[PDB]
Amino acid sequence: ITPVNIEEELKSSYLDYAMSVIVGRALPDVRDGLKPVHRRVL
DNA sequence: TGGCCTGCAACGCGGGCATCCCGATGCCGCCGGAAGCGAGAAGAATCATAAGCCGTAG
């Protein structure tokens, strides 16, 4: 079973990765100014 | 408190007029010296191209 797929999966995965990195990795919050790594460590 | 400005009377010589000599000057012919325009060459400068570090991620 080899279903034919469109190239748009590239852009979809890129958008998903960009959203994930922007939300949960890089940008801290304004209520405490702490990264999720620092949060988990504390 | 001391010096500049000015009225006044007496001494002084320069301005005004006449004139012949002199030196600048316009003109003409002749000789020369920057010039300036374009063109070629040199230096000065701002735009365009390849990471490096910052800290997590694989």
Reported in sequence order, the residue ranges of chain A that DSSP labels E, i.e. its strands, are: none
Shortest CA to C1' contact from A35: nucleotide:
B56
Give whole-number Cα distances, A24 to A3, A4, A38, in Å: 33, 33, 12
Q: How far apart are CA A29 and CA A33, in angstroms?
A: 5
Residues at the strand B interface (Cβ < 7 Å)? A 25-26, 35-37
Resolution of the determined structure in angstroms stands at 6.6
Name the DSSP class of A30: T
List of residues 6+ apart from A34 with CB closer than 8 A: A28, A42
